Amino acid sequence: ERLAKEAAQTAELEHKEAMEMAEKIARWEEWNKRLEEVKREERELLEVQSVPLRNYLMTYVMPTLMQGLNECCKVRPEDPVDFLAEYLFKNNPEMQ
């Protein structure tokens, strides 16, 4: 009977190890998923890095920047910088 209880002890210990393995594998799979999010960010970095500065600024910033500048001019504010910065903070949350 003692030997049978020893076998139960080791069986449950090894089932604990199987649980810990299943957790470790789930952790590793989530770790690979996270890494794939990181490699997505890597691809985005490569995409931006591809673009020489003139073109990168022109495409990404200038249309939005031009539009906001136009609206700031229509404001003729006491400070363009403050208005434009706030305007961008409001717009870009929607505007891409």
Partner 1 sequence: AMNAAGNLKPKLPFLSVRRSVLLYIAFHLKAFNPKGSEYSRKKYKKKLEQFVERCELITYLSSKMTRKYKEPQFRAIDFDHKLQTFLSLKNIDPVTG
Partner 2 sequence: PTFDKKPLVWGEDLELYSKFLDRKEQLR
**CA 4, CA 38: separation in Å to the nearest integer?**
50
Copy the structure tokens of residue 13: 């210990």
State the burial class of residue 68 (Cβ atoms within 10 Å of its Cβ: 0-12, 13-18, 19+). Answer: buried
Which entry of partner 2, its own copies, partner 1, none binds 70, CB below 5 to 8 A by partner kind? none
Closest by alpha carbon to 84, among 66, 96, 72? 72
Min dist CB 74 to partner 2, Å, is 19
Residues making contact with partner 1 (CB under 8 A): 16, 20, 23-24, 27-28, 31-32, 34-35, 37-39, 41-42, 44-45, 47-49, 53, 56-57, 60-61, 64-65, 79, 81-82, 84-85, 88-89, 92-93, 96
Sites for its own copies among residues 67-96 (CB under 8 A): 71, 74-75, 77, 82-83, 86
